[PDB]
Amino acid sequence: MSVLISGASGYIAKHIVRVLLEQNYKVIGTVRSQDKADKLLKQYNNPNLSYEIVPEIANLDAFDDIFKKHGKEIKYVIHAASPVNFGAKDLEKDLVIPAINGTKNMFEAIKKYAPDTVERVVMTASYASIMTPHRQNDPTLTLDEETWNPVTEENAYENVFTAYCASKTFAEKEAWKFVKENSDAVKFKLTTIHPSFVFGPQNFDEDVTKKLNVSCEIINGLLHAPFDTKVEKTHFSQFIDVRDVAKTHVLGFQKDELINQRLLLCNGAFSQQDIVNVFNEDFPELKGQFPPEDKDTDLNKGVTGCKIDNEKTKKLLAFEFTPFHKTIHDTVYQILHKEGRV
């Protein structure tokens, strides 16, 4: 019963792999290069961990070799690989295609090589496949676990963000379509996880680099912004802590009540200024080294944008989510401590 995790070098995946190893699972991670496999193996230093090389999830039958090799021992699959970095003017080839093709590739590989062996697939979708991007600030829209981003292929590429959100939406659509079309052929049950913007520390301190992964780069850029930088105080989106996201993925293949569930991971609205306020509150001795405190935010005026109804998700998961102030605090502390400032 090993666990296969797609895209094991990224921000969220490294936490997922940490939780899996905490629970004594045997783990096979997918990474682009031997280069990245070598560094990861030294970071975890755990004999239960191995990596296979998948250079490009969009390519033909990308995951077939893994299942030809380990098909008999893999019992659970976490499909977390999807493009988050991409050329702003290659939205199809860098973003939508690998999102969709990586998902078809993973599911077809299971059907071809382990149809009666793989028991559960937990797929990292996104809050982006549930929400409507241009209605994040609309309090009359309520989102729940059965809501879908209505983006179409025609209007998907309005800008880089709608494109990414469409990439997650189209990929998830294909996953459920595959599941409904192959109920009797393949044995695995699918669970999708839908994080909103994921904040929290990098799994390893050494991965605190000059530029972080996209979601935490939001925090990192605000933390290093000149004191006079204009900070938006208007509602931006929902957040979730990476450690809750990692925990949720692992539960996702363990708990039978999470079968066929879309899990909506949000724990609070925020603006950029709400993040900046944590800097000033929690590290007052650094006041002036980053933009100032301002309590006049949408959030502090009762303004949180579209309504999040994830009561079903919270009941199913049963563990309590990490609050915003702590998530931001831990992100910031790890950066400042790495820099020798606190």
Ligand SMILES: NC(=O)c1ccc[n+]([C@@H]2O[C@H](COP(=O)([O-])OP(=O)(O)OC[C@H]3O[C@@H](n4cnc5c(N)ncnc54)[C@H](OP(=O)(O)O)[C@@H]3O)[C@@H](O)[C@H]2O)c1
């Ligand atoms: N706010 C968030 O962070 C957030 C929210 C909702 C959902 N998600 C989803 O969580 C998952 C991980 O996101 P993240 O924040 O951890 O960003 P990340 O650090 O950039 O991780 C992305 C992972 O997927 C790999 N990947 C992307 N495209 C690939 C491709 N075409 N072929 C092979 N590997 C590919 C990446 O490897 P390389 O770096 O080597 O290319 C990396 O390991 C993604 O599916 C993302 O859509 C993230």
